Amino acid sequence: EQPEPRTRRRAYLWCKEFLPGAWRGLREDEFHISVIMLFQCSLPDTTATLGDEPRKVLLRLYEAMVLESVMFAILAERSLGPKLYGIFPQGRLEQFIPSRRLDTEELSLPDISAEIAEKMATFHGMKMPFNKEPKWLFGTMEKYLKEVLRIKFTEESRIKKLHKLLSYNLPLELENLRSLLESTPSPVVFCHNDCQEGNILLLEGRENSEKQKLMLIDFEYSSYNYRGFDIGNHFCEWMYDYSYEKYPFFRANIRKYPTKKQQLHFISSYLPAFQNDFENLSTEEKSIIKEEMLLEVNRFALASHFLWGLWSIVQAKISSIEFGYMDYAQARFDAYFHQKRKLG
Ligand SMILES: [Cl-]
Numbered sequence: 001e002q003p004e005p006r007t008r009r010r011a012y013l014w015c016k017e018f019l020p021g022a023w024r025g026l027r028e029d030e031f032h033i034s035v036i037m038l039f040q041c042s043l044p045d046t047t048a049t050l051g052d053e054p055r056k057v058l059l060r061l062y063e064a065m066v067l068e069s070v071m072f073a074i075l076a077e078r079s080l081g082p083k084l085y086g087i088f089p090q091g092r093l094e095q096f097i098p099s100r101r102l103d104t105e106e107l108s109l110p111d112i113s114a115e116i117a118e119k120m121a122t123f124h125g126m127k128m129p130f131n132k133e134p135k136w137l138f139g140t141m142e143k144y145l146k147e148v149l150r151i152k153f154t155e156e157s158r159i160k161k162l163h164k165l166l167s168y169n170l171p172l173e174l175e176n177l178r179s180l181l182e183s184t185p186s187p188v189v190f191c192h193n194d195c196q197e198g199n200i201l202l203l204e205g206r207e208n209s210e211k212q213k214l215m216l217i218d219f220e221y222s223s224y225n226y227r228g229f230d231i232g233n234h235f236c237e238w239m240y241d242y243s244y245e246k247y248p249f250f251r252a253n254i255r256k257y258p259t260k261k262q263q264l265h266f267i268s269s270y271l272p273a274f275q276n277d278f279e280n281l282s283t284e285e286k287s288i289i290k291e292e293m294l295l296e297v298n299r300f301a302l303a304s305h306f307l308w309g310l311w312s313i314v315q316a317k318i319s320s321i322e323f324g325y326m327d328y329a330q331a332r333f334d335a336y337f338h339q340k341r342k343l344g
Contacts, residue, residue: 001035008033010090011059015041018086018093021053037061040096054085054095061091071128071219080123081217097215099201104241107197107234108262114269115214116200116234121273123216124189124227134188136223137303138178144310145170151317158316161326165313165333177306184299185292186228193221195230196237231270232301235263236308239335248324252331254338263294298343305336 003011012031015023022043032042042056049055072092075081086093106112148170153159192199199218206213235258241251258266267290272278278286309332316325 003033003035003039007039007061011039011041014059014086014088014091014093015057018088019053019057021050022047023053033059041093056096057085058082058094058096059091060094067130068219071130071222074128075126075219078126080126081215081219097201097217098204099215100204102197102200102202102214103243104197104238104256106202107238108256108258110265111210112214113258113262113266115211116195116216117266117269118211118273119200119214119216120192120195120230120234121270123192124230124274126190128190128224130190130224132188132224134225136193136225137181137229137307138174141174141303141307141310144307144314145174147317148310148313151313153317158326161330162313165309165326165329168333170310174306177302180299181226181228181303184228184296186226186296186300188224189227189230191223191225191227191230192216192219193223193225193230193233194218195234196240196242198242226300228296228300229303231267231297232299233304235266235297236301236304236335240331247322248327249322250324250328250331252328252335254335257335257339260294263297264290267293267297298339302336302339302343305332305339309333309336 002008008031009028011033012026012028015031016026017024026043026047030044030047032040032044034040036058037060039059039061040056041059043049069087069092072081072094073084073087076084076095082097083095084092085095102112107116148166151162153162195216199216201215201217203213203215238256238258239253241253242249244251271286271289271293278289281289309329312325312329312332315321315323316329319325
């Protein structure tokens with residue numbers, strides 16, 4: 001798919017002035033761009049590279065803007081994210097990573113899950129120049145609840161759906177969750193906050209490799225937060241498939257939440273990646289750490305339900321993307337109460 005000519009010529013100008021070598025001398029008629037909002041920009045196959053410039057790039061078109069840009073640049077410097085080739089008011093030129101997204105069902109593959117754990121442990125070792133107070137989680141939940149209390153739907157169906165969600169007394173329930181998570185030690189670390197299959201790239205040519213085949217992307221929500229949240233949110237995503245092509249445009253299956261065995265496999269890979277010499281501790285000390293972490297992560301998974309449930313109600317009101325947001329909200333709240341119950 002070709003972009004609008006206006007943006008083709010803007011994209012041409014950005015690539016020509018921000019990228020080195022063959023790009024600097026490129027004529028407009030030689031420029032290739034296609035829509036992946038995201039575009040692949042590329043040199044002609046018959047133009048040789050002059051040095052080490054990329055033959056192709058990703059063009060992403062868009063206080064918080066400052067923070068997102070600094071974060072992306074730092075993760076790029078550290079080789080945790082795609083390289084950053086250009087930044088400008090309207091967007092960014094990034095490294096194009098040959099890859100595909102993971103599907104929901106691949107998250108449980110033991111090699112995949114072990115790698116995700118390792119990649120997340122590395123992310124959580126990142127020092128960033130951002131507020132270290134973990135106020136994102138309840139701050140965001142409080143902010144969405146405020147909106148949800150005042151939503152009025154006009155459509156018959158949505159009015160009824162909102163009434164049911166509201167009948168739980170969400171303000172009181174949020175405070176119950178706050179109290180549970182307050183009594184629950186979890187280190188504050190730099191979190192991805194959205195580690196779903198959609199944001200994990202499987203790297204082309206590396207599919208046959210045991211350990212180095214993924215990259216985490218999409219740092220929109222990344223902030224300092226309870227480590228429990230990041231892992232618990234990830235576990236929750238085992239239950240949700242968003243590639244369903246008919247309404248509501250997702251499928252939920254509570255039965256696909258990782259078993260304690262699967263959770264143990266994941267954290268047995270997280271822990272030594274986070275703590276270099278974890279493997280030298282007494283079996284019962286590793287056991288104790290693992291037991292206490294699993295209780296931590298499953299309590300914080302309740303916050304994943306609550307937060308994304310609240311987020312989905314707000315989106316029902318304000319979004320124009322086609323997705324069964326009210327139904328999704330109900331699925332998340334259904335899982336919140338189900339898991340609250342099994343936990344006790
Ligand atoms: Cl174990």
